[PDB]
Write a protein that binds this ligand. Sequence first.
Ligand SMILES: COC1=C(OC)C(=O)C(C/C=C(\C)CC/C=C(/C)CC/C=C(\C)CC/C=C(\C)CC/C=C(\C)CC/C=C(\C)CCC=C(C)C)=C(C)C1=O
Ligand code: HEM
Ligand code: HEM
Ligand code: HEM
Ligand code: HEM
Ligand code: HEM
Ligand SMILES: COC1=C(OC)C(=O)C(C/C=C(\C)CC/C=C(/C)CC/C=C(\C)CC/C=C(\C)CCC=C(C)C)=C(C)C1=O
Ligand SMILES: COC1=C(OC)C(=O)C(C/C=C(\C)CC/C=C(/C)CC/C=C(\C)CC/C=C(\C)CCC=C(C)C)=C(C)C1=O
Ligand SMILES: COC1=C(OC)C(=O)C(C/C=C(\C)CC/C=C(\C)CC/C=C(\C)CC/C=C(/C)CCC=C(C)C)=C(C)C1=O
Ligand code: FES
Lengths: 69, 109, 57, 28, 28, 116, 387, 387, 34, 153, 51
Amino acid sequence: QPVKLKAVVYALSPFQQKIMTGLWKDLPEKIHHKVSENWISATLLVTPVVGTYWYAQYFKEQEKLEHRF
Amino acid sequence: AFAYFVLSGGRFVYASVLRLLVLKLIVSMSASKDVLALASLEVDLGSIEPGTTVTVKWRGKPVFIRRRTEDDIKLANSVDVGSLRDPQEDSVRVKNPEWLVVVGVCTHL
Amino acid sequence: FEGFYKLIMRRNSVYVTFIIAGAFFGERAVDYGVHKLWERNNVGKRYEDISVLGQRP
Amino acid sequence: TIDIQAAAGWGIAAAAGAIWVVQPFGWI
Amino acid sequence: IDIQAAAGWGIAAAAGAIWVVQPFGWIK
Amino acid sequence: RLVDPRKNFLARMHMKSVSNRLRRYGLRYDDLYDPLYDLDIKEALNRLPREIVDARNQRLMRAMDLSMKHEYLPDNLQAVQTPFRSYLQDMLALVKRERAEREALGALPLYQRTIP
Amino acid sequence: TIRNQRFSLLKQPISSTLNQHLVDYPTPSNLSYWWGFGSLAGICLVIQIVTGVFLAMHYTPHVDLAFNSVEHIMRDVEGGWLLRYMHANGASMFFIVVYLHIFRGLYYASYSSPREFVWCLGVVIFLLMIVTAFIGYVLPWGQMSFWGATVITSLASAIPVVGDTIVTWLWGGFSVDNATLNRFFSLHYLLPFILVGASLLHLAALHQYGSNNPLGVHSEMDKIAFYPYFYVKDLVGWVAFAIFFSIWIFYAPNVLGHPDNYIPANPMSTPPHIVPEWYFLPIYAILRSIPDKAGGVAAIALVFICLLALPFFKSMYVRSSSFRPIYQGMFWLLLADCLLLGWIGCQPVEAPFVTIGQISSLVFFLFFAITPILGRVGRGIPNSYTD
Amino acid sequence: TIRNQRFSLLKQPISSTLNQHLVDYPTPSNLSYWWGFGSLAGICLVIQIVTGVFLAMHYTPHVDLAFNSVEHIMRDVEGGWLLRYMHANGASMFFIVVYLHIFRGLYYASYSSPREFVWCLGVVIFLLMIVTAFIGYVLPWGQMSFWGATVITSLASAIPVVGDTIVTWLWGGFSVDNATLNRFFSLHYLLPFILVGASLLHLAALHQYGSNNPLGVHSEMDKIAFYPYFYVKDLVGWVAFAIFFSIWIFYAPNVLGHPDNYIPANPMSTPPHIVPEWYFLPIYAILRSIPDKAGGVAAIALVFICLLALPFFKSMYVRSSSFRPIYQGMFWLLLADCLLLGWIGCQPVEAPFVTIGQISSLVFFLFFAITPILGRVGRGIPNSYTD
Amino acid sequence: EVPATVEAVKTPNSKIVYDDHNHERYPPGDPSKR
Amino acid sequence: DRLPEPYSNESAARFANGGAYPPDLSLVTKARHNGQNYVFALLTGYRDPPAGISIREGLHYNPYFPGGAIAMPKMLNDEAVEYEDGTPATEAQMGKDVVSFLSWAAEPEMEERKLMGFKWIFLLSLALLQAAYYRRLKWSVLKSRKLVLDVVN
Amino acid sequence: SWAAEPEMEERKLMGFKWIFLLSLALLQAAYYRRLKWSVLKSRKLVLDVVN
Ligand SMILES: COC1=C(OC)C(=O)C(C/C=C(\C)CC/C=C(/C)CC/C=C(\C)CC/C=C(\C)CC/C=C(\C)CC/C=C(\C)CCC=C(C)C)=C(C)C1=O
Ligand code: HEM
Ligand code: HEM
Ligand code: HEM
Ligand code: HEM
Ligand code: HEM
Ligand SMILES: COC1=C(OC)C(=O)C(C/C=C(\C)CC/C=C(/C)CC/C=C(\C)CC/C=C(\C)CCC=C(C)C)=C(C)C1=O
Ligand SMILES: COC1=C(OC)C(=O)C(C/C=C(\C)CC/C=C(/C)CC/C=C(\C)CC/C=C(\C)CCC=C(C)C)=C(C)C1=O
Ligand SMILES: COC1=C(OC)C(=O)C(C/C=C(\C)CC/C=C(\C)CC/C=C(\C)CC/C=C(/C)CCC=C(C)C)=C(C)C1=O
Ligand code: FES
């Protein structure tokens, strides 16, 4: 079923705009946004992997030293 | 009522044909006659040192051999049969006091 | 770039031949250059650089 | 009178492509 | 109509299993 | 009640996080309800006035444009957003209440989902 | 309009079906690059089929010639090393792309209504992919191939009464031998074509309602044609994938594999370390987490039961994790847990990996048991969070 | 109507395309039993795929094992003789029902407008069927497998410049050897799945206009549903074909072939009577009649050019041979010529068979030369025969 | 009050401003970059 | 002709080597973890066992071998070979040379593979820049569009 | 003769049984087709046209 919309849209031709310079425009703010929104998500993905890996190396090292005469 | 009888008659054949063609396909993957031919043989063995094992060969299956020492048998004869998931004494498994012969394939996979 | 546009981009048939030529000549130019870097990075390690080559008794 | 020019320009494209996929420089 | 039909199809499925797989000897 | 923000401080942060996320795109929480998700929703949407649906459809188009552009609502527009101003929940409850009444009396359903 | 004359050739009956499903199909304008992995998986499937057809012109499915025919591909046929490495590492690229594809649908709740059948067809495709890649890995007939085929056919023995007769029917004998290899080759040719049909039905289910979008909202008010907008966006991913694929092919063609499969299969000696390919390790870890034969096999089936039942849980009406903070957090924990399970399957079965494997398996199943609770509880969010 | 509720399950989106294309599709009510060989051809294709897949689980594509693995199927595989005979004779059955399918179309002018794409897709299907059948016949690696392949892979040498280059690339060497057999096996697995896809396109292209009928007239006023009227009409033909097939499988399993394929291939000696399968004989007799290698290959191509060009010749507006008595007799002469060409093909090259083949090849091509002029003359029939 | 869309349809504007977060326009009247 | 076999079959090899099979060396650097370094370290790594470790007669201690007991004896004694070019054939020199030979034998396509990889990764990188520009050129009309709507909140 | 065709006896016994069964299925199939088509084949069609 079609929607029934009322809007005004202005568009400029692709051959009247700069195409690539927008990739490195306000670069610091982009990084700021990415770390600000996603630091909780990155912690919930990185902490269990690194924590479990670190414990396994910690376990294997001690177990290797108890069996050593 | 009459037409149901006539139609059921040919449905007996239709189901029978379906059964045959499917079962022929399935059974063609079962073990072939030459594969079943090589399914029985016996070999002879020698000897080894006290405390080591030498894998031997059969159909596609290895067989383990382990002549056990005295303290080895003491160890193997101090296990609670109740605590075992498969309660069995070492003397039942062995036809010799020290010579332990067993099919060397894990019963898991 | 409009002078270039007037000779090559005006007709697709020419512009297609331009892409086939550039695929040919571009590929050959990269082939030579990668081989020159490999020769310059591996001095003395080639089969023609075996000193006793041809002298096996 | 362009169809003859489009034919001639697409034949040149076909000939360049053929010399490009098969590169028979050792055979010429 | 719901339990009767369920038992009827359950009978049909069991007969079909006995018909496709014929384990006459597994009755031990 | 654990879900009530006036009592549970974790529910307060939950509301704040959701409200901040909706505000960035100009969306209301009811705009996240899709007619395709559930037939009760599209029955409720059809019962709402044209002006309500037009504003919802416009807020959805505005958010999609922002989402496409990787940009947010300007901060002077975010200040006037009303993320939890409701227009759909009361109608949706009524529609579901009428469906339960039909079921309790053995009536046929007024609308059914197609089997995909 | 009355179609007396002929307009655009795309709308003629010769090309109308192709035009309306590939050129003009409406797509949500705010799709991100995470929506480019369906076409990447389609390309990987084509790459596997094309290279495998040409590899099958040189491979001999016989236990006395299989290993040497692969070595003859790598040594004698012109460009044979490339066909082999594009096929062996292509299966890895097939599974990386499809895994990213799956977690995209998990993050944005793309499995929810009305797209339950799309997810269900995808789960079947995953099963078809696993079987297809597994039996293919047996074909070189190395040490990993032989002992890998031994245990997975033995999986049927977990059934008490008819388990042993299924295992032997699968083998075609009393052991993994030429009968197993020859039938694995035949099934490995057929299954990819069934994968093609399944992915076509998968796509047709998706076109019933259109694609989901990162906001998870109704998207009919802002849609654009697939061509050229998402063709050129997919083309960016296709080239990026080619660079990624080429690094593996030319500079590291053996890191995603084990050296044990360069030893011809020896039925007498197991290798000390026996593992599947990396894309199967998370299933491997869940299997060994259970200290019971039937328990382990039942857990493996319950993995695909939970995936199939996921779209049918009574959930809240919000799809995307960008508006679901608790579900968003649980998704990243599931992703970390899945990475942990794959690493555990790569380890020998001893302390502390048994305890870690058992906890990782439990947390994986906790994701699917808790999600219906979340939607059920979050149904009351609008009535509790008021303006 | 407003589809608020769910009506018949067949009309729901899960099964609407099967309902519309298979079950409810309108069909002319006066179709004869000649219109039931299209489904038979599809069933023959399915049998070949199913038996071929299970035969490939036991066959080895190596020159040192191919002949003996086919003998191992006939002897050791439980049910192997039936799989091999259902496939070897199924190939003959495939070509019988397709030849009757083709001649049905020629008699009723089924190639005429608006179904030219249907006929063109059929001709492509015929070419794929020939290639699939030929490379499959090489798989047993008997005497006729080896010498049949040596000829056809040499058909490329008629090209002057690159003819020898194509032959050796086709062979994979300098003679027919293991590289040729290994590549024929891979292509023999892949071509039937392309053949399935082409038949699906063929069926779709026909359904754009519906089938032609014996009267050759507009049939919209008397159309009925395919199910169950032409389902039970086709089922009668399916059961009769099963009887016909069973007689070949169980009582004459080897009369359709030649005993020479039961001798293992010998590259040194040459069988004094080298012939193809019987369904390639008419083409093979056309090739033999031209006393020039290049001319013979040109004539074989001209056969498929003539077939592809039939639908596009300006013709009269009447379709059925039931109202075109000259085209009717013209058709019955072609069928006798086609039967003559097959018989001549089995005969060796000597008098009088050389001349008979040359006249018979002439009579075959005269059909496609005299067909267009007959339409140009026949367009004036209504003016001439007035009331 | 008059809705924003109605004002735009009633008042053609020769000073159109485009969204410049992703792309910056060339100055008006510049030659096309084709 | 292939390089000749020392024994007639695997059982003959085991009979000549105390029941142990000298493996085929065509793929050994690909058939072991860290294979090139493994083969070098194993050949040059024969030494005395650690205190309290005894080795069964007929076996030699090598810590790089798993288990530490290898049926191979030390074979790379100094001047065990004489070179054609005039390189001092020490244990370490022969160990280096024989692994270069074995590594090439496992992967004779490496040089062609590496020349192909550098060429195409560079070219595909160029296409990725053009792919990005092409995508951005097509989408610019959408990304810079100005949308006017009636709604406020 | 037996060495070339060791399956002749099993193959022959299958042929007689299944051709007998398939012939019976042909009779049922003929009756089924004609039963289903009888409503169509016996119908009386009245139109206005003559020539
Ligand atoms: C006495 O002597 C004779 C016989 O002996 C007994 C005969 O039996 C016959 C009868 C035989 C026939 C009628 C069959 C002949 C006709 C055909 C078409 C041959 C069938 C065709 C072939 C065998 C050729 C097979 C084709 C190939 C190998 C093509 C290979 C190419 C492939 C697969 C793809 C090409 C690759 C690319 C384009 C690269 C990219 C591809 C991608 C997929 C990405 C005759 C006449 C005869 O006088
Ligand atoms: C060979 C394997 C697969 C192929 C070729 C494939 C192909 C596709 C394509 C082309 C799309 C639409 C475009 C896109 O969203 O990228 C899609 C969407 C989807 N796929 Fe698959 N897919 C595969 C595997 C899977 C699997 C294994 C699953 C789940 C277990 C799955 C679930 C989905 C879902 C839910 C969508 C809709 C996503 C949305 O609209 O946001 N797919 N698939
Ligand atoms: C119809 C298409 C296909 C054919 C004909 C085919 C054929 C083959 C052949 C002949 C081999 C053995 C040669 C070799 O080891 O490299 C092989 C190996 C393999 N195939 Fe396929 N294949 C096909 C599709 C696929 C697909 C779709 C997958 C992935 C799901 C796949 C995964 C593999 C894997 C993992 C191997 C083992 C690679 C190795 O370790 O060497 N193949 N295939
Ligand atoms: C595997 C091979 C083929 C299959 C599976 C197949 C299948 C079918 C089917 C199911 C139909 C509709 C039902 C019918 O009229 O029987 C049909 C119609 C037709 N086929 Fe085939 N066919 C095959 C080969 C061919 C070939 C080789 C030709 C011509 C060279 C051809 C030409 C036609 C034509 C002209 C029709 C329309 C007939 C009419 O409308 O009266 N087909 N085909
Ligand atoms: C994907 C499906 C198919 C597969 C896997 C397949 C595979 C095989 C195999 C393994 C053989 C050798 C076993 C034997 O000698 O009987 C064979 C033979 C043969 N196949 Fe197929 N086939 C397929 C489809 C077809 C089709 C569609 C045709 C018909 C056009 C065909 C015609 C033949 C013929 C004529 C032989 C030789 C029979 C003989 O002389 O023994 N096959 N095929
Ligand atoms: C420079 C000369 C040689 C080289 C480079 C070489 C290389 C190798 C390699 C790579 C292995 C594999 C060890 C493993 O599996 O980890 C091995 C094992 C072996 N080699 Fe050699 N070898 C040489 C000479 C010899 C000689 C001369 C003999 C016998 C006189 C011999 C007998 C063995 C045996 C018996 C083994 C297996 C030992 C075991 O597994 O316990 N090798 N060799
Ligand atoms: C050390 O251990 C292990 C391995 O080893 C190294 C492995 O690799 C794997 C990897 C395997 C996984 C993840 C599961 C594979 C799953 C399935 C379902 C494969 C089973 C299918 C097979 C063998 C072929 C299918 C055959 C059929 C359908 C018969 C055909 C018959 C007809 C058509 C009639 C695991 C878990 C493992 O623990
Ligand atoms: C009115 O029009 C119609 C006809 O004309 C008068 C017909 O004659 C028929 C009957 C004949 C048919 C359907 C021919 C079979 C179809 C094709 C395309 C020929 C070859 C098909 C093959 C080999 C099928 C393989 C495809 C598969 C298995 C697809 C996967 C699907 C499943 C496993 C379910 C039908 C239904 C029809 O309506
Ligand atoms: C809006 O629409 C579209 C999408 O959004 C949902 C897409 O994601 C894509 C891109 C992805 C696609 C089409 C994935 C489909 C892949 C499949 C089914 C697996 C690989 C494909 C094969 C083998 C082709 C099968 C199709 C045909 C006709 C067989 C014949 C083809 C060949 C022999 C090459 C496209 C083109 C599209 O338009
Ligand atoms: S097979 Fe030894 S434990 Fe699984």
